[PDB]
PDB file of C-alpha atoms in Angstrom:
ATOM      1  CA  UNK A   4     -33.960 111.588 -13.445  1.00 33.67           C
ATOM      2  CA  UNK A   5     -33.148 112.237  -9.719  1.00 33.34           C
ATOM      3  CA  UNK A   6     -36.543 114.133  -8.954  1.00 34.89           C
ATOM      4  CA  UNK A   7     -38.355 111.014 -10.027  1.00 33.10           C
ATOM      5  CA  UNK A   8     -36.835 109.748  -6.792  1.00 33.90           C
ATOM      6  CA  UNK A   9     -37.340 112.569  -4.311  1.00 32.16           C
ATOM      7  CA  UNK A  10     -39.938 110.702  -2.382  1.00 32.47           C
ATOM      8  CA  UNK A  11     -41.213 107.134  -1.880  1.00 34.19           C
ATOM      9  CA  UNK A  12     -41.629 105.319  -5.186  1.00 35.53           C
ATOM     10  CA  UNK A  13     -43.402 102.007  -5.604  1.00 34.48           C
ATOM     11  CA  UNK A  14     -41.441  99.042  -6.902  1.00 37.19           C
ATOM     12  CA  UNK A  15     -42.441  95.857  -8.711  1.00 39.02           C
ATOM     13  CA  UNK A  16     -40.045  92.961  -9.382  1.00 40.15           C
ATOM     14  CA  UNK A  17     -40.634  89.926 -11.629  1.00 39.14           C
ATOM     15  CA  UNK A  18     -38.145  87.059 -11.984  1.00 39.16           C
ATOM     16  CA  UNK A  19     -38.483  84.004 -14.316  1.00 38.44           C
ATOM     17  CA  UNK A  20     -35.774  81.548 -13.395  1.00 39.70           C
ATOM     18  CA  UNK A  21     -34.222  78.233 -14.438  1.00 39.18           C
ATOM     19  CA  UNK A  22     -31.407  76.730 -12.544  1.00 42.35           C
ATOM     20  CA  UNK A  23     -30.019  73.379 -13.678  1.00 39.16           C
ATOM     21  CA  UNK A  24     -33.499  72.872 -15.152  1.00 39.56           C
ATOM     22  CA  UNK A  25     -35.521  73.641 -12.029  1.00 39.83           C
ATOM     23  CA  UNK A  26     -37.928  76.275 -13.307  1.00 37.56           C
ATOM     24  CA  UNK A  27     -39.342  78.871 -10.881  1.00 35.31           C
ATOM     25  CA  UNK A  28     -40.883  82.304 -10.842  1.00 33.92           C
ATOM     26  CA  UNK A  29     -40.837  85.012  -8.229  1.00 36.53           C
ATOM     27  CA  UNK A  30     -42.808  88.245  -7.826  1.00 33.88           C
ATOM     28  CA  UNK A  31     -41.822  91.050  -5.531  1.00 35.68           C
ATOM     29  CA  UNK A  32     -43.094  94.428  -4.445  1.00 36.64           C
ATOM     30  CA  UNK A  33     -42.307  97.186  -2.012  1.00 35.78           C
ATOM     31  CA  UNK A  34     -41.014 100.753  -2.030  1.00 37.20           C
ATOM     32  CA  UNK A  35     -37.759 102.706  -2.396  1.00 41.64           C
ATOM     33  CA  UNK A  36     -36.810 106.093  -0.784  1.00 40.26           C
ATOM     34  CA  UNK A  37     -33.526 107.099  -2.394  1.00 42.64           C
ATOM     35  CA  UNK A  38     -33.310 110.182  -0.238  1.00 42.67           C
ATOM     36  CA  UNK A  39     -32.305 107.749   2.452  1.00 40.46           C
ATOM     37  CA  UNK A  40     -30.882 104.956   0.190  1.00 40.70           C
ATOM     38  CA  UNK A  41     -33.728 102.777   1.670  1.00 39.49           C
ATOM     39  CA  UNK A  42     -35.561  99.829   0.116  1.00 41.84           C
ATOM     40  CA  UNK A  43     -38.211  97.631   1.693  1.00 39.54           C
ATOM     41  CA  UNK A  44     -39.316  94.681  -0.451  1.00 38.13           C
ATOM     42  CA  UNK A  45     -41.158  91.327  -0.199  1.00 36.48           C
ATOM     43  CA  UNK A  46     -40.738  88.453  -2.617  1.00 40.00           C
ATOM     44  CA  UNK A  47     -42.831  85.391  -3.205  1.00 39.02           C
ATOM     45  CA  UNK A  48     -41.964  82.271  -5.077  1.00 41.10           C
ATOM     46  CA  UNK A  49     -45.190  81.623  -6.948  1.00 40.01           C
ATOM     47  CA  UNK A  50     -44.237  78.251  -8.416  1.00 37.66           C
ATOM     48  CA  UNK A  51     -43.890  76.372  -5.108  1.00 35.90           C
ATOM     49  CA  UNK A  52     -40.633  75.790  -3.284  1.00 35.96           C
ATOM     50  CA  UNK A  53     -37.791  78.064  -4.214  1.00 35.52           C
ATOM     51  CA  UNK A  54     -35.096  75.821  -5.740  1.00 36.45           C
ATOM     52  CA  UNK A  55     -32.057  77.811  -4.615  1.00 37.54           C
ATOM     53  CA  UNK A  56     -31.433  79.646  -1.334  1.00 39.09           C
ATOM     54  CA  UNK A  57     -33.148  83.001  -1.056  1.00 42.79           C
ATOM     55  CA  UNK A  58     -29.959  84.878  -0.228  1.00 41.23           C
ATOM     56  CA  UNK A  59     -28.455  83.861  -3.549  1.00 42.71           C
ATOM     57  CA  UNK A  60     -31.011  85.955  -5.412  1.00 43.79           C
ATOM     58  CA  UNK A  61     -30.762  89.097  -3.334  1.00 40.36           C
ATOM     59  CA  UNK A  62     -28.511  90.980  -5.719  1.00 40.14           C
ATOM     60  CA  UNK A  63     -30.639  89.996  -8.672  1.00 41.76           C
ATOM     61  CA  UNK A  64     -33.839  91.319  -7.125  1.00 42.98           C
ATOM     62  CA  UNK A  65     -32.596  98.513  -8.239  1.00 42.32           C
ATOM     63  CA  UNK A  66     -29.450 100.626  -7.679  1.00 39.80           C
ATOM     64  CA  UNK A  67     -31.272 103.699  -8.744  1.00 40.82           C
ATOM     65  CA  UNK A  68     -32.413 103.703  -5.081  1.00 41.08           C
ATOM     66  CA  UNK A  69     -28.916 104.360  -3.774  1.00 41.89           C
ATOM     67  CA  UNK A  70     -28.339 107.493  -1.855  1.00 35.42           C
ATOM     68  CA  UNK A  71     -25.741 109.584  -3.723  1.00 33.25           C
ATOM     69  CA  UNK A  72     -24.508 112.392  -1.516  1.00 34.62           C
ATOM     70  CA  UNK A  73     -24.913 115.728  -3.172  1.00 33.65           C
ATOM     71  CA  UNK A  74     -21.328 116.168  -3.976  1.00 31.91           C
ATOM     72  CA  UNK A  75     -21.515 112.917  -5.936  1.00 29.82           C
ATOM     73  CA  UNK A  76     -24.665 113.621  -7.880  1.00 30.46           C
ATOM     74  CA  UNK A  77     -23.054 113.678 -11.348  1.00 29.19           C
ATOM     75  CA  UNK A  78     -21.793 110.179 -10.819  1.00 28.75           C
ATOM     76  CA  UNK A  79     -25.282 108.656 -10.342  1.00 27.10           C
ATOM     77  CA  UNK A  80     -25.607 106.644 -13.521  1.00 31.51           C
ATOM     78  CA  UNK A  81     -28.694 104.872 -12.314  1.00 27.95           C
ATOM     79  CA  UNK A  82     -30.950 107.845 -11.820  1.00 25.24           C
ATOM     80  CA  UNK A  83     -29.647 109.521 -14.920  1.00 25.50           C
ATOM     81  CA  UNK A  84     -31.028 106.810 -17.180  1.00 24.28           C
ATOM     82  CA  UNK A  85     -34.632 107.067 -15.824  1.00 27.97           C
ATOM     83  CA  UNK A  86     -37.448 107.024 -16.601  1.00 28.23           C
ATOM     84  CA  UNK A  87     -36.591 105.071 -19.773  1.00 28.82           C
ATOM     85  CA  UNK A  88     -34.308 102.772 -17.790  1.00 29.02           C
ATOM     86  CA  UNK A  89     -31.367 100.557 -18.190  1.00 26.16           C
ATOM     87  CA  UNK A  90     -30.678  96.925 -18.931  1.00 26.94           C
ATOM     88  CA  UNK A  91     -28.667  95.199 -16.205  1.00 25.02           C
ATOM     89  CA  UNK A  92     -26.743  92.070 -16.967  1.00 26.60           C
ATOM     90  CA  UNK A  93     -24.641  89.850 -14.784  1.00 26.93           C
ATOM     91  CA  UNK A  94     -22.817  86.609 -14.584  1.00 27.34           C
ATOM     92  CA  UNK A  95     -22.509  85.435 -10.971  1.00 28.68           C
ATOM     93  CA  UNK A  96     -19.930  82.748 -10.383  1.00 29.04           C
ATOM     94  CA  UNK A  97     -20.422  80.685  -7.261  1.00 29.01           C
ATOM     95  CA  UNK A  98     -16.936  79.483  -6.181  1.00 28.25           C
ATOM     96  CA  UNK A  99     -16.545  75.759  -6.798  1.00 25.09           C
ATOM     97  CA  UNK A 100     -20.145  75.601  -7.993  1.00 27.48           C
ATOM     98  CA  UNK A 101     -22.298  76.642 -10.956  1.00 30.69           C
ATOM     99  CA  UNK A 102     -23.221  80.096 -12.169  1.00 30.65           C
ATOM    100  CA  UNK A 103     -26.164  82.533 -12.744  1.00 33.02           C
ATOM    101  CA  UNK A 104     -26.566  84.727 -15.888  1.00 31.12           C
ATOM    102  CA  UNK A 105     -29.228  87.301 -15.578  1.00 32.07           C
ATOM    103  CA  UNK A 106     -30.629  89.987 -17.754  1.00 30.58           C
ATOM    104  CA  UNK A 107     -32.953  92.668 -16.413  1.00 30.00           C
ATOM    105  CA  UNK A 108     -34.712  95.822 -17.475  1.00 31.76           C
ATOM    106  CA  UNK A 109     -35.223  98.403 -14.715  1.00 31.43           C
ATOM    107  CA  UNK A 110     -37.399 101.325 -15.827  1.00 32.43           C
ATOM    108  CA  UNK A 111     -40.523 103.214 -14.808  1.00 34.89           C
ATOM    109  CA  UNK A 112     -43.898 101.778 -15.889  1.00 34.75           C
ATOM    110  CA  UNK A 113     -46.193 104.526 -14.813  1.00 33.79           C
ATOM    111  CA  UNK A 114     -45.186 105.791 -11.422  1.00 36.90           C
ATOM    112  CA  UNK A 115     -43.774 102.341 -10.476  1.00 37.82           C
ATOM    113  CA  UNK A 116     -40.122 101.369 -10.715  1.00 37.56           C
ATOM    114  CA  UNK A 117     -40.032  97.871 -12.198  1.00 38.85           C
ATOM    115  CA  UNK A 118     -37.185  95.400 -12.368  1.00 41.68           C
ATOM    116  CA  UNK A 119     -38.053  92.569 -14.756  1.00 44.52           C
ATOM    117  CA  UNK A 120     -35.609  89.698 -14.746  1.00 47.71           C
ATOM    118  CA  UNK A 121     -34.592  86.510 -16.552  1.00 48.91           C
ATOM    119  CA  UNK A 122     -32.129  84.216 -14.807  1.00 49.06           C
ATOM    120  CA  UNK A 123     -30.599  80.917 -15.937  1.00 47.45           C
ATOM    121  CA  UNK A 124     -28.307  78.999 -13.690  1.00 49.21           C
ATOM    122  CA  UNK A 125     -26.077  76.145 -14.824  1.00 47.71           C
ATOM    123  CA  UNK A 126     -23.503  73.715 -13.660  1.00 50.24           C
ATOM    124  CA  UNK A 127     -24.628  73.615 -10.091  1.00 47.97           C
ATOM    125  CA  UNK A 128     -23.649  70.533  -8.039  1.00 43.74           C
ATOM    126  CA  UNK A 129     -26.818  68.681  -6.970  1.00 44.29           C
ATOM    127  CA  UNK A 130     -25.476  68.537  -3.476  1.00 45.47           C
ATOM    128  CA  UNK A 131     -23.365  71.757  -3.236  1.00 48.14           C
ATOM    129  CA  UNK A 132     -24.343  74.764  -1.080  1.00 45.06           C
ATOM    130  CA  UNK A 133     -26.809  76.096  -3.618  1.00 46.01           C
ATOM    131  CA  UNK A 134     -29.059  73.269  -4.898  1.00 45.83           C
ATOM    132  CA  UNK A 135     -28.308  71.588  -1.563  1.00 45.52           C
ATOM    133  CA  UNK A 136     -29.663  74.602   0.426  1.00 48.20           C
ATOM    134  CA  UNK A 137     -26.760  74.867   2.821  1.00 46.26           C
ATOM    135  CA  UNK A 138     -26.582  78.664   2.972  1.00 45.56           C
ATOM    136  CA  UNK A 139     -27.694  80.492   6.081  1.00 47.43           C
ATOM    137  CA  UNK A 140     -30.636  82.988   5.999  1.00 50.01           C
ATOM    138  CA  UNK A 141     -28.609  86.134   6.614  1.00 46.34           C
ATOM    139  CA  UNK A 142     -26.547  88.613   4.643  1.00 45.75           C
ATOM    140  CA  UNK A 143     -23.375  90.508   5.115  1.00 43.76           C
ATOM    141  CA  UNK A 144     -22.554  94.175   4.362  1.00 41.11           C
ATOM    142  CA  UNK A 145     -20.657  94.769   1.031  1.00 43.37           C
ATOM    143  CA  UNK A 146     -19.070  97.453  -1.188  1.00 45.66           C
ATOM    144  CA  UNK A 147     -19.973  97.477  -4.871  1.00 48.10           C
ATOM    145  CA  UNK A 148     -17.400  98.964  -7.197  1.00 48.44           C
ATOM    146  CA  UNK A 149     -18.526 100.957 -10.160  1.00 49.44           C
ATOM    147  CA  UNK A 150     -16.551 102.121 -13.212  1.00 53.30           C
ATOM    148  CA  UNK A 151     -17.661 103.639 -16.500  1.00 51.69           C
ATOM    149  CA  UNK A 152     -17.383 101.681 -19.688  1.00 53.26           C
ATOM    150  CA  UNK A 153     -17.533 104.400 -22.327  1.00 50.93           C
ATOM    151  CA  UNK A 154     -17.649 102.069 -25.321  1.00 51.82           C
ATOM    152  CA  UNK A 155     -21.122 100.726 -24.421  1.00 54.51           C
ATOM    153  CA  UNK A 156     -22.202 104.071 -22.875  1.00 57.15           C
ATOM    154  CA  UNK A 157     -22.694 102.313 -19.571  1.00 56.61           C
ATOM    155  CA  UNK A 158     -20.923 101.164 -16.420  1.00 56.76           C
ATOM    156  CA  UNK A 159     -19.203  97.972 -15.314  1.00 53.19           C
ATOM    157  CA  UNK A 160     -19.658  96.779 -11.774  1.00 50.42           C
ATOM    158  CA  UNK A 161     -17.765  94.106  -9.875  1.00 51.39           C
ATOM    159  CA  UNK A 162     -18.043  92.869  -6.310  1.00 51.19           C
ATOM    160  CA  UNK A 163     -17.914  89.534  -4.499  1.00 50.91           C
ATOM    161  CA  UNK A 164     -20.720  88.361  -2.207  1.00 53.97           C
ATOM    162  CA  UNK A 165     -19.794  86.398   0.954  1.00 54.31           C
ATOM    163  CA  UNK A 166     -22.736  84.015   1.697  1.00 57.23           C
ATOM    164  CA  UNK A 167     -22.426  82.355   5.116  1.00 54.74           C
ATOM    165  CA  UNK A 168     -22.540  78.603   4.949  1.00 55.92           C
ATOM    166  CA  UNK A 169     -24.106  76.455   7.610  1.00 56.78           C
ATOM    167  CA  UNK A 170     -20.584  75.124   8.577  1.00 56.15           C
ATOM    168  CA  UNK A 171     -19.126  78.527   9.497  1.00 57.06           C
ATOM    169  CA  UNK A 172     -17.384  78.890   6.202  1.00 55.21           C
ATOM    170  CA  UNK A 173     -18.267  81.260   3.343  1.00 57.94           C
ATOM    171  CA  UNK A 174     -19.452  80.597  -0.187  1.00 56.56           C
ATOM    172  CA  UNK A 175     -18.203  83.404  -2.417  1.00 57.54           C
ATOM    173  CA  UNK A 176     -20.273  84.567  -5.372  1.00 56.43           C
ATOM    174  CA  UNK A 177     -18.318  86.705  -7.826  1.00 57.84           C
ATOM    175  CA  UNK A 178     -20.432  89.258  -9.627  1.00 57.83           C
ATOM    176  CA  UNK A 179     -19.596  90.627 -13.063  1.00 57.79           C
ATOM    177  CA  UNK A 180     -22.156  93.262 -13.987  1.00 58.45           C
ATOM    178  CA  UNK A 181     -22.904  95.636 -16.811  1.00 60.88           C
ATOM    179  CA  UNK A 182     -25.563  98.308 -17.161  1.00 59.84           C
ATOM    180  CA  UNK A 183     -26.606 100.111 -20.362  1.00 58.23           C
ATOM    181  CA  UNK A 184     -29.251 102.715 -20.912  1.00 62.55           C
ATOM    182  CA  UNK A 185     -32.386 101.657 -22.704  1.00 61.90           C
ATOM    183  CA  UNK A 186     -33.033 105.259 -23.820  1.00 61.78           C
ATOM    184  CA  UNK A 187     -31.263 107.421 -26.401  1.00 61.75           C
ATOM    185  CA  UNK A 188     -30.927 110.572 -24.240  1.00 56.63           C
ATOM    186  CA  UNK A 189     -27.616 111.367 -22.572  1.00 58.35           C
ATOM    187  CA  UNK A 190     -26.757 109.560 -19.379  1.00 59.32           C
ATOM    188  CA  UNK A 191     -24.092 110.254 -16.731  1.00 58.66           C
ATOM    189  CA  UNK A 192     -20.904 108.180 -16.984  1.00 58.90           C
ATOM    190  CA  UNK A 193     -19.323 108.227 -13.565  1.00 61.07           C
ATOM    191  CA  UNK A 194     -15.814 108.386 -12.177  1.00 60.07           C
ATOM    192  CA  UNK A 195     -14.875 105.230 -10.173  1.00 57.43           C
ATOM    193  CA  UNK A 196     -16.597 104.860  -6.871  1.00 60.84           C
ATOM    194  CA  UNK A 197     -18.513 102.384  -4.815  1.00 63.11           C
ATOM    195  CA  UNK A 198     -21.832 101.708  -3.059  1.00 60.52           C
ATOM    196  CA  UNK A 199     -21.958 100.387   0.540  1.00 61.12           C
ATOM    197  CA  UNK A 200     -24.932  98.162   1.158  1.00 62.51           C
ATOM    198  CA  UNK A 201     -26.499  96.596   4.204  1.00 60.12           C
ATOM    199  CA  UNK A 202     -29.224  94.020   3.849  1.00 60.78           C
ATOM    200  CA  UNK A 203     -31.603  92.548   6.456  1.00 58.36           C
ATOM    201  CA  UNK A 204     -33.529  89.359   5.614  1.00 56.81           C
ATOM    202  CA  UNK A 205     -36.701  88.187   7.434  1.00 58.24           C
ATOM    203  CA  UNK A 206     -40.048  86.440   7.047  1.00 60.27           C
ATOM    204  CA  UNK A 207     -43.637  87.645   6.937  1.00 60.48           C
ATOM    205  CA  UNK A 208     -45.331  85.739   9.781  1.00 60.68           C
ATOM    206  CA  UNK A 209     -48.707  85.599   7.846  1.00 62.50           C
ATOM    207  CA  UNK A 210     -47.361  84.204   4.610  1.00 63.14           C
ATOM    208  CA  UNK A 211     -47.770  80.547   3.656  1.00 65.30           C
ATOM    209  CA  UNK A 212     -45.767  80.790   0.463  1.00 62.71           C
ATOM    210  CA  UNK A 213     -41.945  80.362   0.304  1.00 61.86           C
ATOM    211  CA  UNK A 214     -40.894  84.039   0.374  1.00 64.65           C
ATOM    212  CA  UNK A 215     -38.351  86.632   1.639  1.00 69.80           C
ATOM    213  CA  UNK A 216     -38.716  90.110   3.212  1.00 68.91           C
ATOM    214  CA  UNK A 217     -35.654  92.258   2.427  1.00 70.31           C
ATOM    215  CA  UNK A 218     -34.850  95.706   3.871  1.00 72.01           C
ATOM    216  CA  UNK A 219     -31.702  97.396   2.580  1.00 70.00           C
ATOM    217  CA  UNK A 220     -29.745 100.697   2.927  1.00 69.02           C
ATOM    218  CA  UNK A 221     -27.422 101.565   0.084  1.00 72.63           C
ATOM    219  CA  UNK A 222     -25.128 104.567  -0.180  1.00 74.24           C
ATOM    220  CA  UNK A 223     -22.607 105.817  -2.739  1.00 72.93           C
ATOM    221  CA  UNK A 224     -19.134 106.908  -1.570  1.00 72.03           C
ATOM    222  CA  UNK A 225     -15.546 107.393  -2.609  1.00 71.36           C
ATOM    223  CA  UNK A 226     -15.409 110.670  -4.488  1.00 71.46           C
ATOM    224  CA  UNK A 227     -14.302 113.977  -2.966  1.00 74.84           C
ATOM    225  CA  UNK A 228     -13.038 115.599  -6.177  1.00 71.75           C
ATOM    226  CA  UNK A 229     -14.900 117.913  -8.607  1.00 75.15           C
TER     227      UNK A 229
END
């Protein structure tokens, strides 16, 4: 439901992770203002040092906060599934390295939008850009393509993240994503389109824990018909 999102809504994020056996947990919190496609979040690794670079988990850590222009409202699958929510699953293939498989439930719990995640990563090279922490602490702007998948009453999403490497090169991370409603009510299955997202990463100067502050703007685009 769109109106659930007309103002600022609190967000909670919980991630339980295991990559090549390094177990870690992260908690996040912040707010989303979909009117402006704006998210402001802070994440903390609560199990010590984060075993993979922060930027690699950005996409894992709430597309219901995208700003869908009015003329695109009927294509907003994400809001349409709330408040009961949707399950979001991905496989993220890091080029020439291992991969992440994640499963999440994004739904309201009270007046808070919560994204609860499980991530397992495998086949990472002990010394590659990921486990070797060679990725820079920045993020590029990307387009996220969305298509309906009527069979599963959800959408399929595909995009490739370009993570800057410390050498000047780029580590690609190919995202295969699927979302399905948790509820039984009808949800909106959209026509193809995309989301344009900009992400800013920073640090909280008062925090001793390994953490990440993330501010993002995300907007839907691509449809001028109907």
